[PDB]
Design an enzyme around this catalytic site. Structure first.
Site, short mmCIF file in Angstrom:
data_model
loop_
_atom_site.label_atom_id
_atom_site.label_comp_id
_atom_site.label_asym_id
_atom_site.label_seq_id
_atom_site.Cartn_x
_atom_site.Cartn_y
_atom_site.Cartn_z
N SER A 43 0.80 -1.22 0.00
CA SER A 43 0.00 0.00 0.00
C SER A 43 0.84 1.28 0.00
O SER A 43 0.25 2.36 -0.07
CB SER A 43 -0.95 0.03 1.20
OG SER A 43 -2.01 -0.90 1.05
N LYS A 46 0.12 3.57 -2.87
CA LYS A 46 -1.02 4.48 -2.93
C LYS A 46 -0.59 5.93 -2.94
O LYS A 46 -1.34 6.78 -3.44
CB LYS A 46 -1.96 4.19 -1.77
CG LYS A 46 -2.60 2.83 -1.91
CD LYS A 46 -3.27 2.36 -0.66
CE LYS A 46 -4.09 1.13 -0.97
NZ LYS A 46 -4.39 0.36 0.26
N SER A 103 -5.88 3.59 3.98
CA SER A 103 -5.36 2.52 3.13
C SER A 103 -6.50 1.76 2.46
O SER A 103 -6.44 0.54 2.28
CB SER A 103 -4.46 1.58 3.93
OG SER A 103 -3.35 1.16 3.16
N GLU A 139 -5.42 -3.52 -6.77
CA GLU A 139 -5.72 -4.14 -5.48
C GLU A 139 -6.73 -5.27 -5.67
O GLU A 139 -7.66 -5.14 -6.46
CB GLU A 139 -6.28 -3.11 -4.51
CG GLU A 139 -5.34 -1.98 -4.14
CD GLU A 139 -4.24 -2.42 -3.19
OE1 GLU A 139 -4.23 -3.60 -2.79
OE2 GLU A 139 -3.39 -1.57 -2.85
N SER A 210 1.29 -3.16 3.80
CA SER A 210 1.41 -4.53 4.28
C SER A 210 0.87 -5.48 3.22
O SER A 210 0.01 -5.11 2.42
CB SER A 210 0.68 -4.73 5.61
OG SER A 210 -0.72 -4.72 5.43
#
Length: 261
Positions: A43, A46, A103, A139, A210
């Site tokens: 992440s 992002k 997230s 994702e 993570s």
């Protein structure tokens, strides 16, 4: 340096593979541990998606207020904010905030789509001089963090330099830059990672990450009270696919870095 021996010992104690890049903006000095090895971004990617949309908003002045529909099919594995607006809309600003501060994975996927796919996120990286960053998937599959897999990776050195440019440099316009900083400073997922290794008086803006293989990341800009800011990237991954997150390793690395500045 003492720091590189302590980081090596930390890594040895953790059983994983640790990557660290510090940039001290006071003198542009860098501290690197596995700084040129590739790590799964998870992440932490992002940030680049949000920054790319911000860059678009420099020309499309109203872009961030553009409503985007959240349909049930858009929901993936982790959507703490998008979940609250299913069958409704969120602005590109709200989606950017959700991706960075909570997230949210659905939010991240809407940003990628706004950019025309993962290749549009990677293109922005190249445009601001990051030839290492590569975003290949959406994702949640970008979090598989398979050892040796170059997809969806970067290096600590590369991410530190890019995060500096986005937050402290002028890769983005003034308003966009400030908005990114405000978003990072309001991250809600980083209390146990880099922030936990630093003085409470220091202001931190960070984006955690993570994934599988116990991958546990945090990238951060740090404003020490009465001192030049620092950029600190900490990447950590482990050899077991089902290993547990090790946010303590990130705090310990930050603490070791703080010992010397």
């Amino acid at each position: 340096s003492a720091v590189q021996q302590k980081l090596a010992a930390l890594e040895k104690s953790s059983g994983g593979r640790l990557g660290v890049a510090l940039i001290d903006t006071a003198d542009n000095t860098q501290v690197l541990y596995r700084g040129d090895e590739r790590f799964p971004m998870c992440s932490t990617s992002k940030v680049m998606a949000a920054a790319a949309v911000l860059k678009q908003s420099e020309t499309q002045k109203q872009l961030l207020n553009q409503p985007v529909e959240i349909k049930p099919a858009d929901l993936v594995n982790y959507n703490p904010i998008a979940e609250k607006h299913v069958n409704g809309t969120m602005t590109l600003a709200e989606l950017s905030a959700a991706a960075l501060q909570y997230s949210d994975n659905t939010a991240m996927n809407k940003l990628i789509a706004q950019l025309g796919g993962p290749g549009g996120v990677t293109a922005f990286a190249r445009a601001i001089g990051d030839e290492t960053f590569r975003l290949d998937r959406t994702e949640p599959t970008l979090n598989t963090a398979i050892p040796g897999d170059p997809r969806d990776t970067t290096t600590p050195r590369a991410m530190a330099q890019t995060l500096r440019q986005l937050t402290l440099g002028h890769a983005l316009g003034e308003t966009q830059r400030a908005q990114l900083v405000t978003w990072l400073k309001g991250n809600t997922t980083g209390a146990a990672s880099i922030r936990a290794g630093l003085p409470t008086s220091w202001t931190v803006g960070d984006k955690t990450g993570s994934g599988d293989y116990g991958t546990t990341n945090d990238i951060a800009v740090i404003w020490p009270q009465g001192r030049a800011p620092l950029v600190l990237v900490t990447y950590f991954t482990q050899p077991q696919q089902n290993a547990e997150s090790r946010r303590d390793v990130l705090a310990s690395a930050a603490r070791i870095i703080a010992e010397g500045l």
